[PDB]
Amino acid sequence: EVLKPRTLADLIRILHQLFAGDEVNVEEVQAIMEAYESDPTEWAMYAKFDQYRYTRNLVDQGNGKFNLMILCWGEGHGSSIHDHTNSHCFLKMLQGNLKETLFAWPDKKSNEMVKKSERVLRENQCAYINDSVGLHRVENISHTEPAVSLHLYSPPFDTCHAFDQRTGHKNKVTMTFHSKFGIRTPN
Ligand SMILES: [Fe+2]
């Protein structure tokens, strides 16, 4: 019932088709991304880690329709609470496990932020978020092993907001790439 990509390259080919116009079936994308069986022989050339923070490694630009990237989470690495500036956002596990915590949006009043959901993303599992679903923070569950995830954002975006969990106040942050197409980027 689900078209099963046999390689990362197959998955990318299918994604170019599914985002070629107008309407995106979210559950169809999610099922196809999940059906791909993570193969580190296929994506190790994008898995470039850093000691102190997670890295973002661009795989494909989707003919302007989306960004496909691989995020590398060192031991104990996690994100801040953030939004996804009005895009579709798909996140698939390639290695290890991520804990996702969904947060409610703050209002004007300064307040401790409220959790709405907490889960661990299993092996090969594909999760979905957008701004109407909530905010989230994502974290490697392991302090001894890495995590690796495949992210599709549509349309692409280069900025988002990070949120202070104690107050709900936010700051705009520019997203940078650690590498693109397997090639490390400058400082
Ligand atoms: Fe995110």
From Swiss-Prot:
Catalytic activity: L-cysteine + O2 = 3-sulfino-L-alanine + H(+)
Maturation and modification: The thioether cross-link between Cys-89 and Tyr-153 plays a structural role through stabilizing the Fe(2+) ion, and prevents the production of highly damaging free hydroxyl radicals by holding the oxygen radical via hydroxyl hydrogen.
Chain sites annotated for binding Fe cation: H82, H84, H136
Metal-binding recorded as keyword: yes
SUPFAM superfamilies according to UniProt: RmlC-like cupins
Effect of Y153F: Almost total loss of enzyme activity and iron incorporation. Reduces zinc incorporation by 20%
Keyword Metal-binding: yes
EC number(s) per entry: 1.13.11.20
Record-level Gene Ontology MF annotations: cysteine dioxygenase activity; ferrous iron binding; nickel cation binding; zinc ion binding
GO cellular component terms, A-Z: cytosol
Top-level taxon in the UniProt lineage: Eukaryota
Expression sites by tissue: Highly expressed in liver and placenta. Low expression in heart, brain and pancreas. Also detected in hepatoblastoma Hep-G2 cells.
Cofactor(s) needed by this chain: Fe(2+); Ni(2+); Zn(2+)
Biological pathway: Organosulfur biosynthesis; taurine biosynthesis; hypotaurine from L-cysteine: step 1/2
GO biological process: cysteine metabolic process; inflammatory response; L-cysteine catabolic process; lactation; response to amino acid; response to azide; response to cAMP; response to ethanol
Alphabetized InterPro entries for the sequence: CDO_1 (IPR010300), RmlC-like_jellyroll (IPR014710), RmlC_Cupin_sf (IPR011051)
Keywords carried by this UniProt record: Dioxygenase, Iron, Metal-binding, Oxidoreductase, Thioether bond
Factors inducing expression: In hepatoblastoma Hep-G2 cells, down-regulated by phorbol 12-myristate 13-acetate (PMA).
Subunit structure as annotated in this protein's UniProt entry: Monomer.
Function: Catalyzes the oxidation of cysteine to cysteine sulfinic acid with addition of molecular dioxygen.
Family, per entry: Belongs to the cysteine dioxygenase family.
Name listed for the protein in its UniProt record: Cysteine dioxygenase type 1
UniProt gene name: CDO1
